Design a protein around this ligand. Structure first.
Ligand code: HEM
Ligand code: HEM
Ligand SMILES: C[C@H](O)[C@H](O)[C@H]1CNc2nc(N)[nH]c(=O)c2N1
Ligand SMILES: C[C@H](O)[C@H](O)[C@H]1CNc2nc(N)[nH]c(=O)c2N1
Ligand SMILES: CCCCNC(=N)NO
Ligand SMILES: CCCCNC(=N)NO
Ligand SMILES: [Zn+2]
Lengths: 410, 407
């Protein structure tokens, strides 16, 4: 069954056959759509078919499907599974898998860049200190003095579920948050709970508005351990406005490396619970969400005041006005400091070309509209007008529960 | 079975059970979400009639009463004999209100119970429809103090005697593709604007010409009618700061009135049921004015604001967008014409969702349509999880008549 997707701004119609290979569930049914819902140890029994599916995709991608190399590998893996209950991926398969989990990430608007991904094989790591070293090298390589390079570091896969490797931080770089006795919060409200764990674990918090949190690393299922990322390795950008000279006095800055560290990478049925990855920011992640979400730095008012906007009634659109300036500032500061960043128009225009390319050469591109459309100026970006089909393909990146809610402390 | 919905800005969680009464499909499957797709017999009839009457009586606290049972049998017998039936005025009103209540893509449903219903089921001709429509327009406009309303024409019979309002909305501007290759007026209406032209209309070939109604009664060919200008309230768009704004020569009509949908109540289909509420500012300022396929006025407005349109990263399109929308709301409020900004409207919707969850056990909502076209995450609906499902009575999409009509 072929599915048609239309762009109501250009009438370009596309056909999707790719979804026919989808296997996982979406959370929706023929009676209800869960499209805006944020979150809707394997057995030998279930593992081999997952491995086969993967190795077939892999061997077909290199044009060796049916080859002896392909057949042998299938027998090798199969034997290994029956022999050990699991199996190890060749380096080539790991790189391929990692790149494809990104290619399949329907919530990611930056996928045009999917084939350019530096993969760091950290499967030989055994300790938290070991993890710390691998992560510092990832941060340095990735930051590349402001000229960002996409990368991912992959730690040992899950075995019995009692020896998981995990990066407790949700992102490698984020600012601490502190709940004050008067109910106010200093720093980033999103990280208050994690910040409490770090402090409890021994972190000496400077209790400021932009303190970089310490890495909290768990190796082989052991209790996690704290590590400070060398400051010289954390690239930061002071935020200022090209016209509003008072903007800088707002005392704002943000880090340049966005590195998701709490997701699970699944390849051939194998689970990589610690797989920190990074690209570069789209301006609105910082300017719209991090700075203006009511539950984050919530800076709209203050910026609103300084601009002396009519804040008496919402219909003045004072919030919308301050929002644009804040985002103008973030983009301005990053470009001035020569730190890679992409605006929402560029990013979405690019995703549109990527998507079209993918329908033609791949037969589709799963995409989650709800996440793809930028948090500001939605309809003046091309993705707003683009019908998208969302389905799950593997390899893929999945959510997993927070470690503090599952870990058995030793 | 009991689904939960979370608001990520406020941590509030609501439990949904209303979906368990859903009956129609969504377009999605366990393997694919089509949440962003724009358009995903006597025996058939009685069951629909029963589901409806059941909920109607339940709403009036007379569920399983004799009246309930009596009516169920009357309609029952009526279908067996007439292959259809007629709703009691009370049922018609209840149904229309609930079709609105069930409109998952409508953000202004907090207003759902206040709906003026005009029963035009006795209409028989295009002139009759024109009279009913002018009356609707006038009543709803109320000199600027808009009142929500719907006018319901005769239900479908054998499909060869359907009533239809060929316009997509009661009041729209015409569009004509010029020699230049460009488009004059509303690009969206070029096809309709032509069907009028070709049907007989004499276009003033302007940029904001109110289109003529094209009514179809009982299946006959449609006829043209020009709405009395004094009945079409318009608003000249000026900025509360940019005196030059006015020179753009922009204006918009005050009455938003969808006329191409189908109202389904207890199995019956009303193919001509124009309805209207009042505008949320972004509909005009963001979509009508700034869509590249509409009046596409960003550049012009950006130029007059003297912004660097060299690089997209200066966010000139964004800046202008904000001014344009500040103007729209400004004017409307200046001319005392009802309008609502996306902040106020979305805030209302959240409040309505909370009422619906605690009083009805849920509220179907299509996030893709509920979140405003600009400033998405600064409105509360952006952070609100929404479950979408189809309940009846409802408003459904239907084929444009000119692709089904046999002249
Ligand atoms: C090259 C630069 C890239 C850009 C500009 C880009 C941009 C984005 C943005 C704007 C989001 C939404 C983030 C949010 O709202 O929290 C996103 C999500 C995502 N990206 Fe990308 N991305 C890039 C690279 C990457 C890389 C390298 C990977 C994978 C190897 C990746 C995988 C994902 C995933 C899995 C999500 C959704 C995360 C979640 O569910 O929380 N992205 N991306
Ligand atoms: C009184 C204030 C009301 C407000 C502010 C409001 C606002 C909205 C908005 C912003 C949309 C999206 C329109 C678009 O983007 O095309 C919408 C759609 C819709 N509304 Fe409401 N509405 C109101 C009244 C009504 C009434 C009276 C009805 C019907 C009884 C209604 C039924 C619907 C339906 C079915 C849709 C979706 C139409 C489509 O799919 O094209 N609305 N409304
Ligand atoms: C493709 C996508 O479904 C389409 O652009 C939708 C998105 N959300 C919308 N939301 C509203 N209110 N109105 C629309 O016309 C749309 N268009
Ligand atoms: C409830 C709703 O799904 C939620 O607020 C989503 C919407 N779209 C999003 N899109 C992106 N890119 N990031 C987010 O965190 C969200 N949050
Ligand atoms: C770190 C924020 C979420 C993912 N965003 C991103 N731009 N990845 O590279
Ligand atoms: C007629 C435009 C779409 C519906 N909008 C509206 N505000 N209804 O009342
Ligand atoms: Zn869905």
């Amino acid at each position: 069954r072929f599915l048609k997707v239309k762009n109501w701004e250009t009438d370009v119609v596309l056909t999707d056959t790719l979804h026919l290979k989808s296997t996982l569930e979406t959370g929706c049914t023929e009676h209800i759509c869960m499209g805006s819902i944020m979150l809707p140890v394997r057995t030998k029994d279930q593992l081999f078919p997952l491995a086969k599916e993967f190795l077939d995709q892999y061997y077909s991608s290199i044009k060796r499907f049916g080859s002896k190399a392909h057949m042998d590998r299938l027998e090798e893996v199969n034997k290994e599974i029956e022999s050990t209950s699991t199996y190890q991926l060749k380096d080539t398969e790991l790189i391929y898998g990692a790149k494809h989990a990104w290619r399949n990430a329907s919530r990611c608007v930056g996928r045009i860049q999917w084939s350019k991904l530096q993969v760091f094989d950290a499967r030989d790591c055994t300790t938290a200190h070991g993890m710390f070293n691998y992560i510092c090298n990832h941060v340095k390589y990735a930051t590349n003095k402001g000229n960002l390079r996409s990368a991912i570091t992959i730690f040992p896969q899950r075995t019995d579920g009692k020896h998981d490797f995990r990066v407790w931080n949700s992102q490698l770089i984020r600012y601490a948050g502190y709940k004050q006795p008067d109910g106010s919060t200093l720093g980033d409200p999103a990280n208050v709970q994690f910040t409490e764990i770090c402090i409890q674990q021994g972190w000496k918090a400077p209790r400021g508005r932009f303190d970089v949190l310490p890495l909290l690393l768990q190796a082989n299922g052991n209790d996690p351990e704290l590590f400070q990322i060398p400051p010289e390795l954390v690239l930061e950008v002071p935020i200022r406005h090209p016209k509003f000279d008072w903007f800088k006095d707002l005392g704002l800055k943000w880090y340049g490396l966005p590195a998701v560290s709490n997701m699970l990478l699944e390849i051939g049925g194998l689970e990589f619970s610690a797989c920190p990855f990074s690209g570069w920011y789209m301006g609105t992640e910082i300017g719209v969400r991090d700075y203006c979400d009511n539950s984050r730095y919530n800076i709209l008012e203050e910026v609103a005041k300084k601009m002396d906007l009519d804040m008496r009634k919402t219909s003045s659109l004072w919030k919308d006005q301050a929002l644009v300036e804040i985002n103008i500032a973030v983009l301005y500061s990053f470009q001035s400091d020569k730190v890679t960043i992409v605006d929402h128009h560029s990013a979405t225009e690019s995703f549109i070309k990527h998507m079209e390319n993918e329908y033609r050469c791949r037969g589709g591109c799963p995409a989650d509209w709800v996440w793809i459309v930028p948090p500001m100026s939605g309809s003046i970006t091309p993705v707003f007008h683009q019908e998208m089909l969302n389905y799950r393909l593997t390899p893929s990146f999945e959510y997993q529960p927070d470690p503090w809610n599952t870990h058995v402390w030793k």
